[PDB]
Design an enzyme around this catalytic site. Structure first.
Site, PDB file in Angstrom:
ATOM      1  N   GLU A   1       0.713  -1.301  -0.089  1.00 53.28           N
ATOM      2  CA  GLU A   1       0.107   0.031   0.015  1.00 53.28           C
ATOM      3  C   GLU A   1       0.612   1.218   0.114  1.00 53.28           C
ATOM      4  O   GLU A   1       0.577   2.287   0.490  1.00 53.28           O
ATOM      5  CB  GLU A   1      -1.073  -0.123   1.280  1.00 53.28           C
ATOM      6  CG  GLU A   1      -2.216   0.990   1.026  1.00 53.28           C
ATOM      7  CD  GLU A   1      -2.795   1.173  -0.309  1.00 53.28           C
ATOM      8  OE1 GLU A   1      -2.898  -0.176  -0.966  1.00 53.28           O
ATOM      9  OE2 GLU A   1      -3.557   1.948  -0.616  1.00 53.28           O
TER      10      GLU A   1
ATOM     11  N   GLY B   1      -9.545  11.594   4.138  1.00 49.71           N
ATOM     12  CA  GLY B   1      -8.700  12.959   3.850  1.00 49.71           C
ATOM     13  C   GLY B   1      -7.329  12.766   4.706  1.00 49.71           C
ATOM     14  O   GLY B   1      -6.571  13.738   4.369  1.00 49.71           O
TER      15      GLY B   1
ATOM     16  N   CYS C   1      -5.127  10.059   4.687  1.00 52.30           N
ATOM     17  CA  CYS C   1      -4.359   9.119   3.946  1.00 52.30           C
ATOM     18  C   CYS C   1      -3.031   9.732   3.389  1.00 52.30           C
ATOM     19  O   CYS C   1      -3.230  10.882   2.993  1.00 52.30           O
ATOM     20  CB  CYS C   1      -5.012   8.290   2.908  1.00 52.30           C
ATOM     21  SG  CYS C   1      -5.960   6.994   3.396  1.00 52.30           S
TER      22      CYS C   1
HETATM   23  C1  LIG Z   1      -7.667   7.733   3.294  1.00 52.76           C
HETATM   24  C2  LIG Z   1      -8.044   7.845   1.815  1.00 52.76           C
HETATM   25  C3  LIG Z   1      -9.383   8.295   1.617  1.00 52.76           C
HETATM   26  O1  LIG Z   1      -9.962   9.128   2.276  1.00 52.76           O
HETATM   27  O2  LIG Z   1     -10.320   7.760   0.892  1.00 52.76           O
HETATM   28  C4  LIG Z   1     -11.692   8.280   0.781  1.00 52.76           C
HETATM   29  C5  LIG Z   1     -12.585   7.272   0.152  1.00 52.76           C
HETATM   30  C6  LIG Z   1      -8.606   6.785   3.832  1.00 52.76           C
HETATM   31  C7  LIG Z   1      -8.438   6.737   5.544  1.00 52.76           C
HETATM   32  C8  LIG Z   1      -9.787   6.005   6.072  1.00 52.76           C
HETATM   33  C9  LIG Z   1     -11.122   6.112   5.881  1.00 52.76           C
HETATM   34  C10 LIG Z   1     -11.967   5.821   7.167  1.00 52.76           C
HETATM   35  N1  LIG Z   1     -10.864   5.988   8.253  1.00 52.76           N
HETATM   36  C11 LIG Z   1      -9.597   5.863   7.587  1.00 52.76           C
HETATM   37  O3  LIG Z   1      -8.401   6.310   8.396  1.00 52.76           O
HETATM   38  N2  LIG Z   1      -8.264   5.481   3.531  1.00 52.76           N
HETATM   39  C12 LIG Z   1      -9.301   4.651   3.064  1.00 52.76           C
HETATM   40  O4  LIG Z   1     -10.459   4.972   2.755  1.00 52.76           O
HETATM   41  C13 LIG Z   1      -8.987   3.085   2.137  1.00 52.76           C
HETATM   42  C14 LIG Z   1     -10.020   2.110   2.350  1.00 52.76           C
HETATM   43  C15 LIG Z   1     -10.431   1.957   4.086  1.00 52.76           C
HETATM   44  O5  LIG Z   1      -9.726   2.539   4.857  1.00 52.76           O
HETATM   45  C16 LIG Z   1     -11.108   0.860   4.423  1.00 52.76           C
HETATM   46  N3  LIG Z   1     -11.205   0.405   5.687  1.00 52.76           N
HETATM   47  C17 LIG Z   1     -10.773  -0.995   6.120  1.00 52.76           C
HETATM   48  O6  LIG Z   1     -10.852  -1.638   5.115  1.00 52.76           O
HETATM   49  C18 LIG Z   1     -10.485  -1.540   7.455  1.00 52.76           C
HETATM   50  C19 LIG Z   1     -10.092  -2.783   7.910  1.00 52.76           C
HETATM   51  C20 LIG Z   1      -9.940  -2.883   9.351  1.00 52.76           C
HETATM   52  C21 LIG Z   1      -9.662  -3.920  10.157  1.00 52.76           C
HETATM   53  O7  LIG Z   1     -10.144  -1.388   9.716  1.00 52.76           O
HETATM   54  N4  LIG Z   1     -10.494  -0.488   8.505  1.00 52.76           N
HETATM   55  C22 LIG Z   1     -12.773   1.288   4.214  1.00 52.76           C
HETATM   56  C23 LIG Z   1     -13.772   0.154   4.475  1.00 52.76           C
HETATM   57  C24 LIG Z   1     -13.138   2.551   4.965  1.00 52.76           C
HETATM   58  C25 LIG Z   1      -9.014   3.455   0.518  1.00 52.76           C
HETATM   59  C26 LIG Z   1      -8.441   2.145  -0.274  1.00 52.76           C
HETATM   60  C27 LIG Z   1      -7.014   1.826  -0.058  1.00 52.76           C
HETATM   61  C28 LIG Z   1      -6.742   0.494  -0.756  1.00 52.76           C
HETATM   62  C29 LIG Z   1      -7.773  -0.208  -1.374  1.00 52.76           C
HETATM   63  F1  LIG Z   1      -7.011  -1.357  -2.276  1.00 52.76           F
HETATM   64  C30 LIG Z   1      -9.074   0.435  -1.586  1.00 52.76           C
HETATM   65  C31 LIG Z   1      -9.345   1.469  -1.040  1.00 52.76           C
END
Ligand SMILES: *[C@@H](CC(=O)OCC)[C@H](C[C@@H]1CCNC1=O)NC(=O)[C@@H](CC(=O)[C@@H](NC(=O)c1cc(C)on1)C(C)C)Cc1ccc(F)cc1
Length: 179
Positions: A68, A142, A144
């Site tokens: 990632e 926001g 990441c």
């Molecule tokens: C940062 C990027 C962004 O804001 O994307 C907007 C849609 C973001 C930070 C997180 C959002 C919620 N809280 C976080 O810190 N990252 C993401 O949204 C990725 C995906 C997720 O974080 C998922 N969470 C999980 O899968 C998960 C599993 C466990 C045990 O705890 N959380 C979503 C379900 C919210 C973006 C992403 C990364 C890699 C991929 F292949 C697909 C999508």
């Protein structure tokens, strides 16, 4: 926290891709790192400036599993202050870490996330991911690319969360070696 401040001034930039706003860490020379999901491809906006991306390498481990992280090489005459000495050789946990976020919407933010612990495998939206660590803090969309820092170390890049906990890709120095 003047180390975090130094990092912020010299190495952490507000960026955008087609996927939205992210924090970018510049590591050395023209080399920077982003969360893979940001998918920069061939260009990126750094503080609104459109810049060419000469190469984007999505890191995997020996087994070919997602880490990632995307290493980007920038088409610029600007060199980042070399922070490789602050990246540990082995992925390291830390106590009482600070998450450094810097995007247009979330500028110059220092967020205390508490202790960062080994986590390892992460099913990140269905994408098997390795070498992650975890903090018991409600990170948000926001954030990441945010840089996980501790006592003079840069240990991770924020990649995901479930609303309750946050996860980073661990950093190790070798990711950033020349050849
Ligand atoms: C940062 C990027 C962004 O804001 O994307 C907007 C849609 C973001 C930070 C997180 C959002 C919620 N809280 C976080 O810190 N990252 C993401 O949204 C990725 C995906 C997720 O974080 C998922 N969470 C999980 O899968 C998960 C599993 C466990 C045990 O705890 N959380 C979503 C379900 C919210 C973006 C992403 C990364 C890699 C991929 F292949 C697909 C999508």
């Amino acid at each position: 926290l003047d180390f975090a401040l130094s990092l912020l001034r010299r190495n952490i930039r507000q960026v955008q891709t087609d996927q939205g706003h992210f924090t970018m860490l510049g590591v050395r020379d023209r080399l920077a790192v982003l969360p893979r999901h940001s998918q920069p491809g061939k260009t990126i906006w750094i503080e609104h400036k459109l810049v060419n991306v000469l190469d984007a390498v999505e890191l995997v481990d020996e087994q070919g599993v997602n880490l990632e992280l995307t290493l980007i090489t920038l088409d610029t005459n600007e060199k980042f202050r070399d922070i490789t000495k602050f990246i540990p050789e082995n992925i390291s946990t830390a106590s009482d870490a600070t998450l450094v976020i810097n995007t247009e919407h979330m500028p110059s933010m220092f967020v205390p996330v508490g202790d960062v612990v080994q986590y390892g495998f992460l099913n990140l939206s269905g994408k098997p991911t390795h070498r992650t660590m975890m903090y018991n803090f409600p990170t948000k969309a926001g954030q990441c690319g945010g840089v996980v820092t501790s006592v003079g170390k840069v240990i991770g890049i924020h990649i995901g969360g479930n609303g309750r906990q946050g996860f980073c890709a661990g950093l190790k120095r070798s990711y950033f070696a020349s050849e």
